Amino acid sequence: EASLTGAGATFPAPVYAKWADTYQKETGNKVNYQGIGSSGGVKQIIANTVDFGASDAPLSDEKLAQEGLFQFPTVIGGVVLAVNIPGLKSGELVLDGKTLGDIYLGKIKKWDDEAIAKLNPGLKLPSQNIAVVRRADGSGTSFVFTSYLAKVNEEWKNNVGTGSTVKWPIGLGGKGNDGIAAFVQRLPGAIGYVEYWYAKQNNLAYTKLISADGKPVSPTEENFANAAKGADWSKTFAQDLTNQKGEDAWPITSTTFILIHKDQKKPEQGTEVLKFFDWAYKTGAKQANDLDYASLPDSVVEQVRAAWKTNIKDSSGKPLY
Numbered sequence: 001e002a003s004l005t006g007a008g009a010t011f012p013a014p015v016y017a018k019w020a021d022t023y024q025k026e027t028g029n030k031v032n033y034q035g036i037g038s039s040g041g042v043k044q045i046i047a048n049t050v051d052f053g054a055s056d057a058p059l060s061d062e063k064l065a066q067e068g069l070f071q072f073p074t075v076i077g078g079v080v081l082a083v084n085i086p087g088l089k090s091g092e093l094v095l096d097g098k099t100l101g102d103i104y105l106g107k108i109k110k111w112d113d114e115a116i117a118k119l120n121p122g123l124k125l126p127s128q129n130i131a132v133v134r135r136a137d138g139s140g141t142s143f144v145f146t147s148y149l150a151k152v153n154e155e156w157k158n159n160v161g162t163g164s165t166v167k168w169p170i171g172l173g174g175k176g177n178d179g180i181a182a183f184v185q186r187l188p189g190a191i192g193y194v195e196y197w198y199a200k201q202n203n204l205a206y207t208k209l210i211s212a213d214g215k216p217v218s219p220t221e222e223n224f225a226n227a228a229k230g231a232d233w234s235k236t237f238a239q240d241l242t243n244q245k246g247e248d249a250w251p252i253t254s255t256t257f258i259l260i261h262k263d264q265k266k267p268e269q270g271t272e273v274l275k276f277f278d279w280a281y282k283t284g285a286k287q288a289n290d291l292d293y294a295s296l297p298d299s300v301v302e303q304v305r306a307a308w309k310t311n312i313k314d315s316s317g318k319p320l321y
Contacts, residue, residue, distance in 0.1 A: 001028035002272035008034075008041015008054030010177040011195045012236035012256045015075055018287045019280050029274055035176060039138020039164050045069065045259045049316070051269045052070040053259040056140025057164055070311045071257045072304045073237045074277065076294040078196045078224040079144055079252035080179045082204040085111055086126040090205035094119050094216045095232045097152025097251065098245070101207075103130055103191060105155055106170035111189065119210075120224070133183040133192030136173030138164045144254040145193045148242040193252075194222070196292050209251050212243040219250050227253035227293035260312065267314035274308055274321045 004015065020031035036044070038055035045053025046067055064071055081095065094203075096102070099115045102108045108115055114126035135142045143164045146285055150157035160166050172187075174180035180192040181202045196319040197218050199206040208216045217223055227249040231239040241253040258277065264270030280288075281301040296304075308321035 001030065004029065004031045004052070004269065004272055004276060005037050005050045006031060006033045006052040006054060006258070006273075007044045007050045008259075009056050009256055010035035011056045011141050011144075012054070012075055012293065013252070014197045014201070015178070015193075015288050015291050017292060019276075022284070022287060023276055023279060027279075028275065029272060031167075034097050035178075037127070037176060038140030038143065041140075042259065045261070048261070048265075051260070051266075053272050054258060056254055056256040057143040057246075058257055059259070060238075061236075064111070068262050069259050070262050070307065071237065071259050071292065072277070072307065073239075073255040073257055073296055073300065074280070075288050076224050076228050076241070076253060076255050076296065077292075078194050078227075078250045079141060079148075079193050079254065080199050080206040080219040081209070082181060082190075082192050082194050082199040082202075082206050083183075084131075084184050084190045085205065086128055086188065087124060088126075088205060091208055091218055092120075092123060092205075093207040094210065095207050096210035097148065101149045101156040102154025104132060104134070104149060104169065104171065104173065105153070105160075106109075106132070106315050109163055109223045113114075128189040131187045131190040132171035133174050133180050133187070133190050133305075134171035135169050135180065136175045137179075140164060140256065141177060141193065142166065143160050144242060144252060146250045151243045151261045161237050173256070179195045186268060200292060200304040211251055212245050213247070213249070215247075217248050217250055221289055221292040221294050223248045223250040224292075228255070233297070233303065237300070237303070238291065261313050262313065264312060264314050264320055265319055267318075270312055270314075271320045274312060278305070278321075 041053040146162040181198040
């Protein structure tokens with residue numbers, strides 16, 4: 001039995017934690033996962049403080065090469081807007097990209113703003129102030145969210161841009177996906193972006209969103225999967241899954257990554273990290289789906305396995321998979 005340590009993205013922390021627990025029950029191996037945000041995860045893996053780091057934001061092939069790291073995707077999740085609006089049921093409210101961006105820009109101050117009312121004809125909206133919540137910590141979810149906003153709101157794109165950390169025009173800072181979930185729960189009128197699980201498991205109402213094709217879609221495991229249908233995984237694991245074309249394609253979808261060293265100084269640890277994720281690929285789909293994360297296609301797991309064989313080695317050049 002091995003004691004493994006991973007750290008980073010809170011976006012997939014629920015599934016990593018479920019997997020870790022099941023893995024220990026079946027094999028005794030212990031995987032400790034620390035949800036510190038993707039930025040912290042990349043920092044920790046580079047400093048060799050953990051066996052694997054985790055980030056929703058992919059590192060470029062050049063950055064990976066400069067750092068001697070290898071990155072592989074695990075699951076597909078979705079970012080949703082958790083809200084606390086008086087009188088509204090979860091999934092009742094519909095927002096499109098431009099209006100969502102105007103909300104994050106601080107231009108739309110009330111829930112019954114004309115722009116929101118037009119996207120929701122017949123929906124009774126309260127004159128409640130919108131309490132914008134965003135991430136305090138360096139975040140892969142912020143990267144995905146701002147990548148999306150830049151595509152649908154020019155003002156956002158030009159003034160704030162995209163990143164794991166950005167100069168938020170407005171909004172209170174929550175620490176981690178759970179921090180934003182907690183804020184939304186205690187703040188009437190709040191809106192905050194979180195990985196789907198954080199909304200669902202905290203019984204937070206969330207909104208529908210207009211797809212890239214122009215249609216209202218609900219955030220569901222299948223709709224996150226739909227957003228990745230046009231992904232040419234063959235080309236790279238670093239797939240952009242925001243605002244993708246297609247029927248029922250959730251617009252703020254994303255995969256997430258695990259970062260490990262190619263040259264394993266502690267080869268038993270590396271070997272065990274690969275076995276945990278391999279077991280997850282072959283055995284953990286039901287657990288991932290149960291937590292509303294879509295599974296990576298089998299072809300993609302085969303690519304990961306093939307890449308592990310050629311990229312992960314000990315100091316003597318011997319493959320750890």
